[PDB]
Design an enzyme around this catalytic site. Structure first.
Site, PDB file in Angstrom:
ATOM      1  N   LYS A  41       0.810  -1.218   0.000  1.00  0.00           N
ATOM      2  CA  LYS A  41       0.000   0.000   0.000  1.00  0.00           C
ATOM      3  C   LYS A  41       0.842   1.267   0.000  1.00  0.00           C
ATOM      4  O   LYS A  41       0.299   2.369  -0.156  1.00  0.00           O
ATOM      5  CB  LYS A  41      -0.947  -0.002   1.199  1.00  0.00           C
ATOM      6  CG  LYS A  41      -1.982  -1.120   1.083  1.00  0.00           C
ATOM      7  CD  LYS A  41      -2.643  -1.110  -0.296  1.00  0.00           C
ATOM      8  CE  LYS A  41      -3.254  -2.473  -0.618  1.00  0.00           C
ATOM      9  NZ  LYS A  41      -4.622  -2.539  -0.084  1.00  0.00           N
ATOM     10  N   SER A 255      -3.125 -13.055   2.230  1.00  0.00           N
ATOM     11  CA  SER A 255      -3.278 -12.512   0.886  1.00  0.00           C
ATOM     12  C   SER A 255      -2.112 -12.938  -0.003  1.00  0.00           C
ATOM     13  O   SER A 255      -2.273 -13.145  -1.205  1.00  0.00           O
ATOM     14  CB  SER A 255      -3.357 -10.983   0.940  1.00  0.00           C
ATOM     15  OG  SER A 255      -3.930 -10.461  -0.251  1.00  0.00           O
TER      16      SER A 255
HETATM   17  C1  LIG Z   1      -5.318  -3.679  -0.691  1.00  0.00           C
HETATM   18  C2  LIG Z   1      -4.532  -4.982  -0.438  1.00  0.00           C
HETATM   19  C3  LIG Z   1      -4.379  -5.927  -1.463  1.00  0.00           C
HETATM   20  C4  LIG Z   1      -4.855  -5.573  -2.873  1.00  0.00           C
HETATM   21  O1  LIG Z   1      -4.047  -4.880  -3.720  1.00  0.00           O
HETATM   22  P1  LIG Z   1      -4.905  -3.784  -4.510  1.00  0.00           P
HETATM   23  O2  LIG Z   1      -3.871  -2.973  -5.402  1.00  0.00           O
HETATM   24  O3  LIG Z   1      -5.687  -2.939  -3.610  1.00  0.00           O
HETATM   25  O4  LIG Z   1      -5.792  -4.631  -5.535  1.00  0.00           O
HETATM   26  C5  LIG Z   1      -3.810  -7.164  -1.204  1.00  0.00           C
HETATM   27  N1  LIG Z   1      -3.384  -7.481   0.000  1.00  0.00           N
HETATM   28  C6  LIG Z   1      -3.461  -6.600   1.006  1.00  0.00           C
HETATM   29  C7  LIG Z   1      -2.955  -7.001   2.395  1.00  0.00           C
HETATM   30  C8  LIG Z   1      -4.025  -5.344   0.816  1.00  0.00           C
HETATM   31  O5  LIG Z   1      -4.078  -4.555   1.759  1.00  0.00           O
END
Ligand SMILES: *Cc1c(COP(=O)(O)O)cnc(C)c1O
Ligand SMILES: *Cc1c(COP(=O)(O)O)cnc(C)c1O
Lengths: 294, 281
Positions: A41, A255
């Site tokens: 981010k 994620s």
């Molecule tokens: C927001 C986020 C994502 C996604 O990436 P985006 O560019 O927003 O599609 C993946 N993993 C985490 C931990 C995130 O915070």
């Protein structure tokens, strides 16, 4: 030497020591955890605030408003501290307290909404506040300043750390700025690079990403950029992630152990396969939630 | 091709932008949170193990031992998986599931199962010379470089004490004066990662010839500063690291146009559930 903000980006690319198939098809990791605020981010948050100090929009001393699952929360909190902004974040109250706390610690104003309201409700509430005079809304979901970061930085990085060689890019989809922005850059490369994108299954809570309801579809999305979209199971997201430190010493969020899942699916699919998978933060702001042992 | 090992070290050096005395000095912090495990103990951990191959003693399959409970448990555990080593760790108090995630195991009268020859060769970070070797080989050159050799004071929060020793080690051999100060709690201060032995110590690797002063930090200043580094500088770290910068600040206060550098051993993320980032008064 160097400023914290110039410590954002230029992240490592590490290939899978052991995991997955081996059929000529290699897999490389984009290590976004390493960002000062500890996630992918930070690239977007920087971009977003400095791109709008540039179009004269925002200015230090100003209050900024964002609705967050946390990371972008923790992101903009940081940079703001660095540049003398005040932040409010909007977050739902099922996200973890480690997410709560890191946003508070950076001195930002944190507002929690119901989980039944969840992310879309925090967006709705974000818009109102700003359009009531409570601050400026940067809107990571519709700000093309977010994917610009990747398309400017992330993308050109992946290419030069794989040289001119990557065949696939697997991305976990939340905002979608990563996949979209990385997709722009790659389209132009005179070689073909296949960008793959991943979404939770039916009922699959994974933090960071979402399949966004129809009227909340990110303006920044662009289906012509996304070749395929893969479906990822919440348990196969926790299962591969845990597999990843135990077996690779890469310590990551769910994620990330998810995007390796798809990335492995691709490799397990295509041989000859150079497949760069995005890892977004680390394992630490998930620790107290029982996912990594109890 | 690159790997996690080469992601260990060469951390960012970061100057304070709005905390400190306004008298001439420049406090620069060394962001050891950046390490792939997110602490300073990645450097020693990898060394400790890596150099236990230059001198053949361990197999990628070998059982390694260390009774640690925190960051060392994390880096060690961290590096073993990197290299195929079977690590076993012992105990803290009576919270840190960050160890087994890396594939480790749960668990003398120091206090603080079982023993070296019993089952695997324990690493002895408190005596193993390959602890400060790391700093002597890397953490010293780096800071020396990044600061254009302009550093005048090194500052460190002292646990296994290897960090200051190695960097002083490297520091001493430079052609300019470089003072070296280690940081220690006042004897009732509870600060994770640093303790006020003797509580019968010094660690084996310690070298009074290598230090230049030792200031006592109370718990209240460490927690407070780490608090301030977060909101005021965008620097989010753990409680010893908070102590580091407070020490650097007293040094800076004493030493006007100085160039001081303090190690930020780790980011504050493993600390949040402690609630230590809530303010107090
Ligand atoms: C927001 C986020 C994502 C996604 O990436 P985006 O560019 O927003 O599609 C993946 N993993 C985490 C931990 C995130 O915070
Ligand atoms: C390692 C560590 C220390 C001490 O550094 P040593 O080189 O062991 O003296 C202090 N605080 C924390 C959080 C540490 O991890």
């Amino acid at each position: 030497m160097s400023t914290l903000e110039q410590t954002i980006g230029n992240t490592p690319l590490v290939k899978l020591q052991r995991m997955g198939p081996d059929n000529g098809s290699e897999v490389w990791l984009k290590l976004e955890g390493n960002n000062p605020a500890g996630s992918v981010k930070d690239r977007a948050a920087l971009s977003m605030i400095v791109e709008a100090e540039k179009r004269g929009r925002i200015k230090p001393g100003d209050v900024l408003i964002e609705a967050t699952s946390g990371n972008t929360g923790i992101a903009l909190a940081m940079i703001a501290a660095l540049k003398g902004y005040r932040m409010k974040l909007l977050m739902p109250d099922n996200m973890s307290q480690e997410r709560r706390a890191a946003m508070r610690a950076y001195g930002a104003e944190l507002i929690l909404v119901t989980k039944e309201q969840g992310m879309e409700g925090a967006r709705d509430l974000a818009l109102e506040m700003a359009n009531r005079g409570e601050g400026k809304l940067l809107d990571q979901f519709n700000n093309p300043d977010n994917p610009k970061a990747h398309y400017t930085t992330t993308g050109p990085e992946i290419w030069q750390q794989t040289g001119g060689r990557i065949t696939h890019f697997v991305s976990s989809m939340g905002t979608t700025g990563t996949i979209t922005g990385v997709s722009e850059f790659m389209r132009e490369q005179s070689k073909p690079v296949t960008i793959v994108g991943l979404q939770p299954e039916e009922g699959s809570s994974i933090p960071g990403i979402r399949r966004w309801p129809t009227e909340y579809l990110p303006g920044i999305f662009n289906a012509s950029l996304v070749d395929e979209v893969l479906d990822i199971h919440q348990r196969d997201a926790e299962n591969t992630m845990r597999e990843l430190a135990v077996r690779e010493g890469i310590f990551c969020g769910v994620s990330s152990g998810g995007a390796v899942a798809g990335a492995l699916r691709v490799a397990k699919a295509n041989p000859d396969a150079v497949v760069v998978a995005i890892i977004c933060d680390r394992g630490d702001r998930y620790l107290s939630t029982g996912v990594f042992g109890e």
